[PDB]
Amino acid sequence: GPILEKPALKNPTATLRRLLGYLRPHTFTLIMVFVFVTVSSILGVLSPYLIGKTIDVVFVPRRFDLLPRYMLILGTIYALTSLLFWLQGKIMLTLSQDVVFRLRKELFEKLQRVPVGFFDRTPHGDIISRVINDVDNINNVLGNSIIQFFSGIVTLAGAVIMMFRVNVILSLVTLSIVPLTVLITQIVSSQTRKYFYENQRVLGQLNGIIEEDISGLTVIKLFTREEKEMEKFDRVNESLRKVGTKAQIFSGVLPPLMNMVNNLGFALISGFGGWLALKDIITVGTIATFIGYSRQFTRPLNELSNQFNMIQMALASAERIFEILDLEEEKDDPDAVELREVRGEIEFKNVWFSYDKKKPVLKDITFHIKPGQKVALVGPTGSGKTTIVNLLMRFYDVDRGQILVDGIDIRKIKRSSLRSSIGIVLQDTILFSTTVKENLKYGNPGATDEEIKEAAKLTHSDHFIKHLPEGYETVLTDNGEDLSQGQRQLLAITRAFLANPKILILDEATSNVDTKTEKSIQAAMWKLMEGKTSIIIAHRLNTIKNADLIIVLRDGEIVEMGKHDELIQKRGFYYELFTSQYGLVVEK
Amino acid sequence: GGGSKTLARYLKPYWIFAVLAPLFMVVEVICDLSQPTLLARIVDEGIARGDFSLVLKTGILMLIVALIGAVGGIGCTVFASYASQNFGADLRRDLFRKVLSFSISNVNRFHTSSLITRLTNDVTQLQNLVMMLLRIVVRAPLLFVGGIVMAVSINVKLSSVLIFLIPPIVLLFVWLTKKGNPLFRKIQESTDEVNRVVRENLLGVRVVRAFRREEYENENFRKANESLRRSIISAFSLIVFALPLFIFIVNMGMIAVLWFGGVLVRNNQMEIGSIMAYTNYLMQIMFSLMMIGNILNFIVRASASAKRVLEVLNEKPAIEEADNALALPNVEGSVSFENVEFRYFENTDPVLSGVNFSVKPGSLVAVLGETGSGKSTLMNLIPRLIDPERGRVEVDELDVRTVKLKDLRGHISAVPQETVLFSGTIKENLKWGREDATDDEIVEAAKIAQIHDFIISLPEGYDSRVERGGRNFSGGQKQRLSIARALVKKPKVLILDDCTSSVDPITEKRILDGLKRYTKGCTTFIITQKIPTALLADKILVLHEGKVAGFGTHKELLEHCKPYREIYESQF
Numbered sequence A: 001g002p003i004l005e006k007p008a009l010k011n012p013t014a015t016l017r018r019l020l021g022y023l024r025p026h027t028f029t030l031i032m033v034f035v036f037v038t039v040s041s042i043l044g045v046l047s048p049y050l051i052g053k054t055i056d057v058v059f060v061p062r063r064f065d066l067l068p069r070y071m072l073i074l075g076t077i078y079a080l081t082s083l084l085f086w087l088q089g090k091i092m093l094t095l096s097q098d099v100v101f102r103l104r105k106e107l108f109e110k111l112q113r114v115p116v117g118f119f120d121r122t123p124h125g126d127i128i129s130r131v132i133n134d135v136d137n138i139n140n141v142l143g144n145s146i147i148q149f150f151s152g153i154v155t156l157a158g159a160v161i162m163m164f165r166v167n168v169i170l171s172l173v174t175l176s177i178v179p180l181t182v183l184i185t186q187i188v189s190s191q192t193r194k195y196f197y198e199n200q201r202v203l204g205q206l207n208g209i210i211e212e213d214i215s216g217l218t219v220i221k222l223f224t225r226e227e228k229e230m231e232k233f234d235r236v237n238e239s240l241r242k243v244g245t246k247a248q249i250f251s252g253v254l255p256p257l258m259n260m261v262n263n264l265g266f267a268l269i270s271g272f273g274g275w276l277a278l279k280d281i282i283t284v285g286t287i288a289t290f291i292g293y294s295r296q297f298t299r300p301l302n303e304l305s306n307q308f309n310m311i312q313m314a315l316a317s318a319e320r321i322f323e324i325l326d327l328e329e330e331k332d333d334p335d336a337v338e339l340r341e342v343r344g345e346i347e348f349k350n351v352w353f354s355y356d357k358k359k360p361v362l363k364d365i366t367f368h369i370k371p372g373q374k375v376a377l378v379g380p381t382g383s384g385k386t387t388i389v390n391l392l393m394r395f396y397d398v399d400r401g402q403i404l405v406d407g408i409d410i411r412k413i414k415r416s417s418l419r420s421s422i423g424i425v426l427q428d429t430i431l432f433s434t435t436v437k438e439n440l441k442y443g444n445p446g447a448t449d450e451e452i453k454e455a456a457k458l459t460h461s462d463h464f465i466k467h468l469p470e471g472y473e474t475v476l477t478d479n480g481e482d483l484s485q486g487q488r489q490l491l492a493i494t495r496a497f498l499a500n501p502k503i504l505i506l507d508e509a510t511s512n513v514d515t516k517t518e519k520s521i522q523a524a525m526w527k528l529m530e531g532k533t534s535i536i537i538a539h540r541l542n543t544i545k546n547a548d549l550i551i552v553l554r555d556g557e558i559v560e561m562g563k564h565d566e567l568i569q570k571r572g573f574y575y576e577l578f579t580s581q582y583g584l585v586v587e588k
Numbered sequence B: 001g002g003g004s005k006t007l008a009r010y011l012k013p014y015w016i017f018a019v020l021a022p023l024f025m026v027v028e029v030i031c032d033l034s035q036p037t038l039l040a041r042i043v044d045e046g047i048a049r050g051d052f053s054l055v056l057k058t059g060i061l062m063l064i065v066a067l068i069g070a071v072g073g074i075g076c077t078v079f080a081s082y083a084s085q086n087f088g089a090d091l092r093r094d095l096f097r098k099v100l101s102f103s104i105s106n107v108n109r110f111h112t113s114s115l116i117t118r119l120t121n122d123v124t125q126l127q128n129l130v131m132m133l134l135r136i137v138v139r140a141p142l143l144f145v146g147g148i149v150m151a152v153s154i155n156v157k158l159s160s161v162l163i164f165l166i167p168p169i170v171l172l173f174v175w176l177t178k179k180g181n182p183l184f185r186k187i188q189e190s191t192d193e194v195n196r197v198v199r200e201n202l203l204g205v206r207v208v209r210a211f212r213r214e215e216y217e218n219e220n221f222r223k224a225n226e227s228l229r230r231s232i233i234s235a236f237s238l239i240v241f242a243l244p245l246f247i248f249i250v251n252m253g254m255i256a257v258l259w260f261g262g263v264l265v266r267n268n269q270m271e272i273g274s275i276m277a278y279t280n281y282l283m284q285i286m287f288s289l290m291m292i293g294n295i296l297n298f299i300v301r302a303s304a305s306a307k308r309v310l311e312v313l314n315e316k317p318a319i320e321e322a323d324n325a326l327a328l329p330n331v332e333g334s335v336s337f338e339n340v341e342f343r344y345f346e347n348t349d350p351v352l353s354g355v356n357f358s359v360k361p362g363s364l365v366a367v368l369g370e371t372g373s374g375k376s377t378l379m380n381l382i383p384r385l386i387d388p389e390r391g392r393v394e395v396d397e398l399d400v401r402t403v404k405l406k407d408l409r410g411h412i413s414a415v416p417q418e419t420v421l422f423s424g425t426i427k428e429n430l431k432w433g434r435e436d437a438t439d440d441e442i443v444e445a446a447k448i449a450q451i452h453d454f455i456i457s458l459p460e461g462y463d464s465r466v467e468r469g470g471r472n473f474s475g476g477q478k479q480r481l482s483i484a485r486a487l488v489k490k491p492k493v494l495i496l497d498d499c500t501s502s503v504d505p506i507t508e509k510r511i512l513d514g515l516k517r518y519t520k521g522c523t524t525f526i527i528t529q530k531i532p533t534a535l536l537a538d539k540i541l542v543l544h545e546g547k548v549a550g551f552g553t554h555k556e557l558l559e560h561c562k563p564y565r566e567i568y569e570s571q572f
């Protein structure tokens, strides 16, 4: 639709040189198409000539022995015009697609080298649509738009130089309609834009009212809001009625008006062509030729104006894609790992971090974990027990202080080794739309289907897995929507178990599980935590009791530490959190 | 039988517009079919007979027909704009009014996502379809039929060339539609698949990365990337072969006209000008015939929007207030269920069964149970959002089905498990239960709701802006905001379905304690899956597997309810 404002690009030539860099490998093929477009566009301006000349040589002089020769010259010229259209058409089809195929390849490989940070900062939906739109937007131009712009320009100039050599006055009479076209086109194009957007505005509002009221219908009824909500819809709707009309009118008067100038042209060429013919100045067949140009200025001109606007727009898109392809990737230092075979000891030393550099989230966090000891991070949301997992998995780098495993800085150890030595289950892990077998294999690729049965058996997953339709090969479409959340957490645990990381940090939700699975879950936990260091999140009453160490966080700081019994008797903040949660003992 | 509702009624009120739209079209099509004939008249009766007046007058006459044709095409578009617009307006209104009346069991049929599209997209399609019916749907066919008519009138014999040109074109259209349709759908499969890989990689990126499986995910993406390239070349290669072949046929058409027309003029049967006018008509017939093709492709799709919209206009509300429903100027807060049984769908066994229990006004009951026990269902019966399949539900010893819905719903006040707010100010949201509520009264509620201090910290404060979804606020203050909204209503029954999930345990305790003193003479349900929160209530209703397992106190319940012990063991 009507562009809002011309796109603001930065050094498009550079991005053009760069975009054309994807075209260099197949240059010969491009030149060929360009000449194909050339020859075919000319061949088409010749048609109205020959036909007019055939009227002049065969028909009027009445010599039909010549008819078969002209009618053979067309049957051949036409044949090529379309032979080329099909060539220049298909030649680009595989070319264009081959280009964006590369752009996609690059963009995706880029998606896995680019810091997790970018995924957290902006919503998933809009970064994908904006990227795929630019990728498509560049497809259109590179594949079709560009050639049709060049085709139409060779056609335009051709038909014009031709007309002038045949006749000047008649040429000037036909080109008389050009100013009319351009002027009308521009006036109608401003109204169409104005109301398009004015309508888009009112429509978006009305639409929003619809999406929210249907999504929150229950609430709307609970509060008896129908009358009020109906009126809210009404006032907007009645203004969409009035605007949508204007929007619908201007967007639709151009075709009739462009037609009108096409007929005004026909008339002129007819009323002067036939009046110069009567002065013997021009020939009749010449009129037929000029008639065949009277539709070569209205729309084909606009298509030139619009195809130009679509090419700029495409550059902007390219520019965006290029900037994304230039984002710095995550790279390990030359001297990092590999981590020696260890049991895994962690340590924080005056670590300061914050997603938003402005607002601090952690602050002077310093502690020490011992190989094999279960640890528990407790606190009220807004603490930092969550922001811990990331830093330790080096999804982010610490701003102050330092972290180390087995006595080696986390920033001086290849992320590859770190991620392999550390495991992670989250309150919100993510299953892939695949066979449960494949999901559980995502950790230790190459693990047999017999070893996985035993492994999945030790975490209380084997039972409900066979109890599924199609056993292990079952496809978990839409990321496990057809499973109970408990059963998913179980699977996530079984998966994490197969990676067998020396260090294992996990966060096990308990909000929406059935008591049955609940036992299966905590049982699987203990059989997942054994034999290795585990940093658990505090939701389980029975894990903060067996915790070799509890470390209470608050407002991004370590207020207390020590075992449960120590912390409750200390009358500490831990006591407050615990008694204001398990102060149910008043009953007993 | 589904329903006799029909969307032709939305156009009727504007029939006058619907009749001028196409009438103004003919005036154009005529003026468009006229041009090529007046050209033949210039050359075969002006130039050949050498009288300037003829050419001059029919030249001037061709100009007038161009302008009149202009007033034609415009008047059409103008009038069709009006008709199609009011059509959508009227259609959209009723469509919205329907949805507002829907019970939850109605929204159950059409998933909520489809409802939105039917009221937004489908409405525009139909709007366009009506726009289309009144312009090109009249245009193209009239140019096609009128074009053929003119050719036949110019010279019957030559028109036989049409009989040869039309069938192959029509045949081309059919072939493409029947070979390309499945190849375009095939593209749609390959595109979406590309998204599934791009979405999952953004979603579970930490998973992927942590498992050092990126390499596997590239190889996994390439597979979808190639499929897209492949699926597109195939489909679009057909397209890029059709267009040129179409242009060829119409071009050979010209040939056939100049060649066969050539003999007719030799045999002194056909003038030279009529040959020029024929070549034009020849084209009009063809291009129109191409437009007619495109129209058909759109119609079938448009038809699907008609069906979806009609289904909605034909659905009946599953909850209806009886004719002499009882007015409830007040309610005390008695709430009872007698042999209540409930299924959401016929295929599944009962979600609730043998539900018998009562509650006296002013009570504070906690409804406890594991996920999928029917707690929310059970509560949704009180405000008549759903009806029992078996048994009844009473409020103040009255059958809810028996009383006015505005009254009943007016005295009840629920805080839904999934919180939703609406566009406007926070203060507007909080007044949803009372328009005349004073500002102080709202501060009271928000204070109890432990949210007044969050609001007060906002630059705009109470006049602060609520995004369309309530997306700007997180779960916590959104959740708390509705508790405030719930309390401002001044309910005689207050349902709190997991209204703590998104707040700190410290904040939670304060709200509930604030209720005890503010829910003065208010029957209150605390729905939750945790024993700690259940213990704050005077008595505990326990649900397990859709049935009431035990109703009493921690002491009683611990000894009597195996589901209670089962829950107890799970948390301790």
Ligand SMILES: Nc1ncnc2c1ncn2[C@@H]1O[C@H](COP(=O)(O)OP(=O)(O)NP(=O)(O)O)[C@@H](O)[C@H]1O
Residues within 6 Å of the ligand: A512, B108, B344, B345, B351, B369, B370, B371, B372, B373, B374, B375, B376, B377, B378, B529
């Ligand atoms: N709108 C619905 N349509 C069809 N089935 C439903 C719907 N809502 C709930 N159910 C099913 O009905 C059963 C009970 O539902 P519900 O009362 O929502 O559970 P609940 O006890 O509130 N669980 P939770 O929300 O986790 O505390 C479950 O098995 C659900 O799968």
Ligand SMILES: [Mg+2]
Residues within 6 Å of the ligand: B375, B376, B417, B497, B498, B527
């Ligand atoms: Mg619930």
